[PDB]
Design a protein around this ligand. Structure first.
Ligand code: CLA
Ligand code: CLA
Ligand code: CLA
Ligand code: CLA
Ligand code: CLA
Ligand code: CLA
Ligand code: CLA
Ligand code: CLA
Ligand SMILES: CC(/C=C/C=C(C)/C=C/[C@@]12O[C@]1(C)C[C@@H](O)CC2(C)C)=C\C=C\C=C(C)\C=C\C=C(C)\C=C\[C@@]12O[C@]1(C)C[C@@H](O)CC2(C)C
Ligand SMILES: CC(/C=C/C=C(C)/C=C/[C@@]12O[C@]1(C)C[C@@H](O)CC2(C)C)=C\C=C\C=C(C)\C=C\C=C(C)\C=C\[C@@]12O[C@]1(C)C[C@@H](O)CC2(C)C
Lengths: 230, 210, 213, 216, 165, 41
């Protein structure tokens, strides 16, 4: 039937294949509950879209501005709009849009009306896929496009995790670390930096310092779960 | 629940806020006005705090507006929180005395119309002078509407009243907060925010203050 | 017919195959009475959950102290925390007592009356504190992923896994205490000393564990 | 139901409709002290008098304390106001206490005889016409009339709310006075000084840090 | 100076007794080493003695011609001259506890009277009932005076008396 | 163990437990508050 993550596996009973991207991977049974599955579905959608934009941004950044480091690109911008005014505008606008999305989650058909201008509203849609002003120019079918979206999004989530850990253990960017891997495949993999043996543990050092100043304070910038590193 | 505008589109509106009160947006997350008599008081309390806050913030801004324009008053330029230390023809003692006496008259009049509508629509002295019947507690009418409003458009006018009133209540609360925080006049605070809006936010000022 | 701690020995009558981790281990018949057995079920579960957290924390801080990161060992972390940060230990202790007293009194009076704590008394929260079973509260708060909901067989499997890892973590924490009492160093210090020379470096070569020689 | 412990067995004497009519019956009687209905009536009266007295006293403690901390007044701390108040007095504290005890025992014996027999102080000819107004109301402890000038008990729509507010603010003020006593014994500073010192550094200035409350 | 007694803060035989006891303990101490278990024990005992004498002299006790503290049992002489915490306050401190014990016992008896075999709940304590009453009997004065005012504290003359009454 | 806990509910065992507890409480009081002759505190 449908392509599963394990070709010979029987999928969990709650995973019947109705969702976009239901490749039968719920070994812990987190989506066994019908009500929490919807929240986890929306969470996957927004994690997917955030990670896709994030990976595209890091890639484009390391293309067109390679002198800056994306792990360091918070303290190497120095906008004139202040470090606090940035946080203020983003906090308020994101609180707005995210509470609107949350009210879409709680009450599905509730928040479609443009509050300021009374004549625009979104059509009745699904939970997680607004459409309307969000979605002009759909190039093809909707279910296949949702499948493609969630697949590229899962790949982008794993890609951002790889970005983070490779920026931590190497201190280089994604494309820079890729050029390092292509410059020495057998000698720059995580297997070639680390090894734990019953008697010896070799964890790679992270090139990210423990703290960065950023204007008179000490921002703690720790490597993710060092110590648990191999 | 109805199709009235809400404070949170999609929220579970409580129900006892049915729209009969001006400014009904279903905002009762504490469920304070659940009792009917409690709400009958709270409506007039909101209206009185609202009108007093509108008068208040007018007396906050306008003095400093005519100061920063450069008009001529002996009490010009002085702040609102330094207007108690100002000196006048009389000390503030007799001013509080006369103020409380006149207000003990008129507020008890208002209260006697509140506990029984239709009571105080007539003068002690001039029986011929009267307020017309059919007016609600809180909206006296008659000589309180001498320029010919409130014939129609009364629902939206009450909505406007309560909206500007809640806005001025928040304005005066902010005046307290900024007079205890920034130490300057509120319009100078507005000008300071209009000078450097991005590094004179409340987070920046609070963090530089500590 | 069912796995038993001491094979051949039949399980006692009060230990049917209904509870998670039931292996017939009650040689003292402590949970003979059903109400006492419910109390002891909740006790085992709370002990095992606290011990799972404790063992994971000890293991993690010992991992960080072994690889050279700035971590105190579990026998020194309290002093380091209250001294590095300006923390008053009585204040912190009574804060913890207040919070845990609220939580555990709620849990207590849901043991004594199971339907309670869900009357909306607390803050209006009804179904977050209703309680599914004895020792398994569930709800939106103690079970946000809803793993007790949905599949029931998976929930029984997770109950078995929970109580089993909990007994293992309790034994592990008792072992941490005994190893600090014996070797005086951290748990993964002992582990590395064992992995270096498994022979000649163990509890038989302490001097305190076996006092004969 | 509004229980003090949501899961507790509420005592049977506070579940009877006589006790559920009492102000603020949250079912708190873990010692079984008001099991007898006559005892519960007497203790309702005692709680009411204690709570009204405590509200008055705790107002006179913190309000003028808050106004001398705000520089509006110069009233001293409550544990020293008697000494400096009797120095500016026309009397010693002994004669003042004697007059106070007489004037208080009179009215308190009137209240006593009204508790023993309800509405009994209104039998005619006792006072010089004022006994007309001393009959009280149907509810004991809520006498009304001369003790209710603004007619706030005549509405019969906020009456239970008034009672609940009274008894709750009063239990709060009883605890507040107990805390004033404890904080005078424990810190030596004023209650508003204690509030300021706690609000300055709460995690290091509290009853866990003084060497008296938790002596271990 | 109530009954001719001198305060222990200014009594001379009191100080002589302190010095005598400390001299005895240091006489025992001189035969031991610097830091040994006997030496630490005797040092702790000396410190306990010093603290005891200091705390008795601080508490305003009255000492006799022998230097020993004498207690004042009379209320009125104790409440006037600051000696209430000697016999008078511990009096009520005792009586609360004693009536508490007695009231818990009475309540337990009255509770087990109604059962089928009341005697077996006396050799075998009903610890649930006993603990419940032992916790809720802390208000024994109020409940006792309320049982007294209702007339339900004393049994009527259904009491088993003798032929000549 | 209903019968065992019934046994521990007997008069002598309960008396032993209760007087052990009382004596230990008084003993620890007399350790942490040595020589309490009067009510000074
Ligand atoms: C009426 C309530 C009330 C309030 C608001 C306060 C507030 C305060 N007390 Mg006081 N206190 C109270 C009652 C109260 N107390 C009572 C009843 C006692 C006797 C048991 C004490 C005994 C006491 C001591 C001995 C000390 C304080 C101190 C303090 C301060 C620090 C808190 C602390 O150390 O723990 C407070 C200690 C307690 C034992 C808490 C008792 C509170 C009870 C349980 C009722 C209040 C709970 C209520 C649900 C929440 C607060 C209500 C509030 C929002 C109105 C703070 C200003 C300390 C201080 O002065 O620091 C500067 C200090 O040394 N208090
Ligand atoms: C019957 C006569 C009598 C009297 C009046 C006393 C009186 C006293 N004796 Mg003496 N004694 C007696 C007979 C007597 N004894 C006999 C017969 C012997 C030989 C066995 C001794 C041998 C003896 C020694 C060897 C010592 C004493 C000591 C004492 C003092 C004890 C003070 C104390 O423990 O504080 C206790 C203080 C309290 C406040 C506790 C009261 C009880 C409860 C706990 C109060 C309730 C509080 C609270 C609500 C409880 C919480 C509930 C709980 C369940 C959680 C006191 C002066 C000691 C001392 O130093 O004397 C000066 C001492 O060392 N006595
Ligand atoms: C997860 C999203 C994300 C985040 C948090 C960042 C964060 C950052 N980027 Mg990256 N970037 C992203 C996505 C992201 N980027 C993507 C998708 C692209 C490809 C277009 C880029 C391309 C890019 C370049 C080429 C550069 C950065 C730079 C930066 C830094 C400064 C940003 C700045 O000055 O903008 C200032 C603010 C604006 C330009 C206004 C935003 C533009 C309008 C208003 C559109 C916003 C609304 C729009 C409809 C999108 C909403 C959907 C959203 C979910 C994606 C900062 C670390 C710069 C850097 O490294 O610093 C020196 C830099 O040179 N980014
Ligand atoms: C989402 C998101 C994520 C994953 C990160 C992640 C990170 N940020 Mg960025 N950051 C974000 C949002 C985010 N930030 C936003 C919204 C702001 C604006 C307030 C910043 C402002 C910011 C600054 C100013 C700094 C970081 C730093 C860091 C690093 C800390 C380790 C890490 C790479 C620090 C860094 O570069 O570490 C090296 C740093 O100095 N971030
Ligand atoms: C601020 C701050 C700073 C500087 C640190 C510092 C540290 N943390 Mg982090 N941590 C913090 C807050 C902070 N913690 C909070 C608020 C939480 C929750 C955690 C949860 C956390 C985990 C789960 C782990 C660390 C670990 C560590 C250590 C190694 C760095 C790492 O994460 O890899 C390092 C001492 C790691 C340790 O090493 C074993 C680790 O595994 N931290
Ligand atoms: C809305 C009512 C209101 C408000 C908010 C204030 C607020 C204030 N008054 Mg004003 N005042 C009021 C009504 C009010 N007053 C009335 C009705 C009178 C009598 C006519 C006064 C007479 C008065 C005097 C005489 C003084 C104040 C002062 C003050 C300040 C006191 C600051 C403090 O606590 O120390 C503060 C800004 C004092 C001030 O500003 O000194 C710095 C001061 O000297 N007030
Ligand atoms: C109930 C079990 C338990 C207990 C009692 C502790 C207790 C402690 N841990 Mg451990 N820990 C645990 C589980 C536990 N942990 C688990 C399951 C993990 C994973 C960790 C991971 C961990 C790290 C990575 C660190 C601690 C630290 C600490 C200390 C301070 C925690 C703190 O600042 O408050 C935190 C309070 C809040 C986050 C506010 C709520 C303290 C000794 C820290 C320390 O300094 O000790 C070595 C530290 O760095 N723990
Ligand atoms: C048992 C009987 C008794 C005896 C013989 C005395 C004897 C005396 N009393 Mg005391 N007295 C007692 C019981 C007794 N008192 C009791 C039960 C109380 C009530 C608690 C008092 C309260 C009391 C006061 C208040 C005073 C006396 C005083 C006196 C003296 C006169 C004399 C020494 C007076 C005094 O101080 O003597 C100098 C005094 O003022 N007595
Ligand atoms: C071993 C244990 C219990 C063992 C019980 C057994 C064998 C019971 C056996 C029986 O009863 C049965 C079953 C049936 C009966 O018929 C027979 C017997 C035989 C009687 C419990 C441990 C229980 C252990 C627990 C709860 C441990 C919790 C640990 C925590 C919280 C640790 C916290 C910290 O270590 C960190 C995380 C960091 C530090 O810096 C700070 C601190 C605080 C030190
Ligand atoms: C009256 C009162 C305070 C009155 C204060 C006054 C007049 C203060 C006056 C002054 O300060 C000023 C104004 C100015 C100063 O310069 C002069 C003085 C004179 C000093 C406090 C009562 C304070 C009363 C208190 C604290 C009572 C607490 C009772 C509790 C906790 C009861 C609990 C229980 O009884 C129940 C409810 C049920 C049982 O089953 C269980 C238990 C637990 C037993």
């Amino acid at each position: 039937s449908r392509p599963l993550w394990l070709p010979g596996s029987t999928p969990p009973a709650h995973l019947k294949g109705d969702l976009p991207g239901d490749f039968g991977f719920d070994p812990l049974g987190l989506g066994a509950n019908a009500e929490s599955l919807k929240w986890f579905k929306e969470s996957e959608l927004v994690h997917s879209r955030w990670a896709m934009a994030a990976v595209a941004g890091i890639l484009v950044q390391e293309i067109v501005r390679p002198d800056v480091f994306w792990y360091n690109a918070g303290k190497e911008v120095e906008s004139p709009l202040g470090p606090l005014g940035l946080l203020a505008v983003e906090f308020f606008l994101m609180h707005w849009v995210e509470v609107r999305r949350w009210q879409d989650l709680r009450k599905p058909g509730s928040v479609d009306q443009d509050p300021i201008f009374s004549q625009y509203k979104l059509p009745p849609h699904e939970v997680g896929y607004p459409g309307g002003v969000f979605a002009p120019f759909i190039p093809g079918d909707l279910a296949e496009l949702k499948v493609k979206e969630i697949k590229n999004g899962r790949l982008a989530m794993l890609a951002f995790v790889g970005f983070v850990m490779a920026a931590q253990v190497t201190g280089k960017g994604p494309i820079a670390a890729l050029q390092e891997h292509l410059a020495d495949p057998w000698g720059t993999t995580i297997f070639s930096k680390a090894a734990v043996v019953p008697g010896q543990a070799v964890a790679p050092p992270c090139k990210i310092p423990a703290s960065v100043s950023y204007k008179g304070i000490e921002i703690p910038t720790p490597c993710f779960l060092q110590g648990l590193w191999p | 629940d109805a199709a009235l505008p809400s404070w949170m589109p999609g929220a579970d509106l409580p129900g006892y806020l049915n729209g009969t009160l001006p400014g009904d947006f279903g905002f009762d997350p504490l469920y304070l006005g659940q009792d009917p008599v409690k709400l009958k008081w709270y409506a007039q309390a909101e209206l009185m705090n609202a009108r007093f806050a509108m008068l208040a913030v007018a007396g906050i801004l306008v003095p400093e507006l005519l100061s920063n324009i450069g008009f001529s008053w002996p009490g010009a330029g002085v702040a609102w929180y330094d207007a108690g230390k100002f000196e006048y023809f009389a000390p503030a003692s007799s001013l509080f005395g006369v103020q409380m006496l006149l207000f003990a008259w008129v507020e008890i009049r208002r209260y006697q119309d509140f506990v029984k509508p239709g009571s105080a629509n007539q003068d002690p002295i001039f029986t011929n002078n009267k307020l017309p019947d059919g007016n609600e507690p809180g909206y006296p009418g008659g000589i309180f509407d001498p320029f010919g409003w409130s014939k129609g458009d009364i629902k939206s006018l009450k909505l406007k009243e309560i909206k500007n009133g809640r806005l001025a209540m928040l304005a005066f609360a902010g005046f307290i907060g900024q007079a205890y925080t920034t130490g300057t006049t509120p319009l100078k605070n507005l000008s300071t925010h209009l000078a450097d809006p991005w590094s004179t936010t409340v987070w920046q000022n609070d963090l530089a203050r500590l | 017919v069912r796995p038993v701690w001491f094979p051949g020995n039949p399980p006692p009558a009060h230990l049917d195959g209904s509870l998670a981790g039931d292996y017939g281990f009650d040689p003292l018949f402590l949970g003979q009475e059903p109400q006492t057995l419910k109390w002891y079920v909740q006790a085992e579960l709370v002990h095992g959950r606290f011990a799972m957290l404790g063992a994971a924390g000890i293991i993690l801080t010992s991992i960080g102290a072994k690889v050279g990161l700035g971590f105190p060992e579990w026998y020194d972390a309290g002093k380091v925390v209250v001294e590095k940060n300006n923390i008053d230990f009585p204040t912190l202790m009574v804060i913890q007592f207040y919070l845990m007293g609220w939580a555990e009194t709620k849990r207590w009076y849901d043991f004594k009356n199971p339907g309670s704590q869900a009357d909306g008394s607390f803050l209006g929260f009804t179904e977050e504190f209703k309680g599914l079973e004895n020792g398994y509260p569930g709800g939106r708060f103690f079970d946000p992923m809803g793993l007790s909901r949905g599949d029931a067989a998976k929930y029984q499997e997770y109950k078995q896994k929970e109580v089993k890892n909990g007994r293992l973590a309790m034994i592990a924490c008792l072992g941490f205490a005994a190893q600090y009492a014996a070797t005086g160093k951290g748990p993964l210090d002992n582990l590395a000393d064992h992995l270096a020379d498994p022979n000649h470096v163990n509890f038989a070569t302490n001097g305190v564990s076996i006092p004969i020689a | 139901r509004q229980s003090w412990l949501p899961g507790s067995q509420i005592p049977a004497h506070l579940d009877t409709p006589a006790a559920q009519a009492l102000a603020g019956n949250f079912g708190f009687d873990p010692l079984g002290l008001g099991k007898d209905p006559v005892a519960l009536r007497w203790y309702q009266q005692a709680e009411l008098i204690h709570c009204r007295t405590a509200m008055a006293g705790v107002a006179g403690i913190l309000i003028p304390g808050l106004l001398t901390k705000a520089g509006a007044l110069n009233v001293p701390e409550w544990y020293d106001a008697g000494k400096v108040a009797i120095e500016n007095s026309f009397a010693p504290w002994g004669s003042l206490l004697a007059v106070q005890l007489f004037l208080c025992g009179f009215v308190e014996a009137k209240r006593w005889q009204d508790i023993r027999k309800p509405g009994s102080q209104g039998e005619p000819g006792s006072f010089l016409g004022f006994e007309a107004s001393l009959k009280g109301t149907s509810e004991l402890g809520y006498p009304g009339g001369p003790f209710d000038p603004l007619g706030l008990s005549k509405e019969a729509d906020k009456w239970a709310d008034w009672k609940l507010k009274e008894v709750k603010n009063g239990r709060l003020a009883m605890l507040a006075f107990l805390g004033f006593v404890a904080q005078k014994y424990a810190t030596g500073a004023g209650p508003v000084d204690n509030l300021a010192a706690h609000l300055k550094d709460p995690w290091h200035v509290n009853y866990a840090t003084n060497g008296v409350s938790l002596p271990f | 100076d109530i009954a001719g007694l001198t305060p222990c803060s200014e009594s001379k035989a009191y100080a002589k007794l302190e010095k005598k006891e400390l001299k005895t303990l240091e006489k025992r101490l001189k035969q031991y080493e610097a830091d040994s278990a006997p030496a630490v024990a005797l040092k702790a005992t000396m410190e306990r003695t010093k603290a005891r004498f200091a705390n008795y002299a601080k508490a305003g006790l009255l000492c006799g011609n022998d230097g020993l503290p004498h207690l004042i049992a009379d209320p009125g002489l104790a409440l006037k001259y600051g000696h209430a915490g000697e016999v008078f306050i511990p009096t009520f401190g005792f009586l609360y506890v004693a009536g508490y014990i007695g009231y818990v016992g009475r309540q337990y008896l009255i509770a087990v009277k109604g059962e089928a075999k009341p005697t077996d709940k006396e050799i075998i304590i009903d610890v649930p009932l006993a603990t419940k009453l032992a916790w809720q009997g802390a208000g024994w004065p109020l409940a006792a005076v309320q049982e007294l005012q209702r007339g339900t504290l004393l049994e009527k003359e259904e009491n088993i008396t003798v032929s000549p009454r | 163990m209903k019968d065992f806990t019934t046994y521990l509910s007997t008069a002598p065992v309960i008396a032993t437990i209760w007087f052990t507890f009382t004596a230990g409480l008084l003993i620890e009081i007399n350790r942490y508050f040595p020589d309490p002759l009067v009510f000074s505190f």
